[PDB]
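Write out the bound-state structure for 1X8.
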Amino acid sequence: EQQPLTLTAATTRAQELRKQLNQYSHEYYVKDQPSVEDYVYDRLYKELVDIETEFPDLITPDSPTQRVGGKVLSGFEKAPHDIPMYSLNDGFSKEDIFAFDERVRKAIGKPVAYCCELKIDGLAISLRYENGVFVRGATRGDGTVGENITENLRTVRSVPMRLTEPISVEVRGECYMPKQSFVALNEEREENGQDIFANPRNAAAGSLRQLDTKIVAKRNLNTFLYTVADFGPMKAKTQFEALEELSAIGFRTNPERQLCQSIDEVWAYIEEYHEKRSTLPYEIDGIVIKVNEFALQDELGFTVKAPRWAIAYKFPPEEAE
Ligand SMILES: NC(=O)c1ccc[n+]([C@@H]2O[C@H](COP(=O)(O)O)[C@@H](O)[C@H]2O)c1
Ligand SMILES: NC(=O)c1cc2c(N)ncc(C(N)=O)c2s1
Ligand code: NA
Ligand code: NA
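---
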């Protein structure tokens, strides 16, 4: 009647299972191409649960079991941002975007490539990893202090609990509610006699500021991550490389990005995705245009409030189209 695993064997087996299950969940949710069928995932998941039941000391923050929800907070702790979560300078016309490029070329002394990306209209978040393990999820708040919503963000399946390398990084992006889930949620709320959400941003914000993680788990949320606070531990030397690297290490990144070799290509991208806007399952409020090379971003620097190497081109609001 002796238990088959010693503590030491269970510890090693738990490590293997968490790594394997995190890999399979990433394939399933983020890559959308699972290498194993659900019953194989479920079988390994149950094995891990049984180990954690027998040996509770083996429950770690990177464990897949820590997603399910159940935890209920009394309130959110403040989450300071040591590196500010800044807002970009804005543009609205062709004139503004070509003027941006003129100012960039004035500073750099040559034409420059731009990394062009969709400005995702959700709740801005920062995800902190230490030794490749998810340790803190935070809202932007005012950009200097937000709310610690780590447990809520664990329920968001696209958020990785571990990375493919044991680096310490602070990763910035957006958490949003897909449009199709937003409209379904409002109908559900209508039927439950609850106030409806004005728009998907409010629904994502409301969802992530619930204290009971079980309720947050019921909501459908997703993420796109696009940069980090400090590139030290990273190998990327350009914004486009940065996006590929974040993707490689486990983050969901937006597939619509494009590296533009001229301002004309930048303008054509803006036009392309203004048209495509309606066809996307997530809301965007514009296009972000960034000087691609980090050496050049470093040369341009920042103003008192914003980068001099990036601009946000704003569309009309989602309600208006
Ligand atoms: N086939 C896979 O690799 C894989 C990975 C994660 C979740 N799932 C499925 O998603 C559902 C929810 O599972 P989780 O709560 O662990 O994310 C289950 O039905 C599970 O089978 C499948
Ligand atoms: N404030 C900012 O710097 C940014 C804000 C956002 C946003 N809301 N969505 C996407 C991007 C992106 N991929 O660059 C950025 S950059
Ligand atoms: Na959910
Ligand atoms: Na359209």
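---
The radius of gyration is 21 Å.
The chain is about 40% helix and 20% strand.
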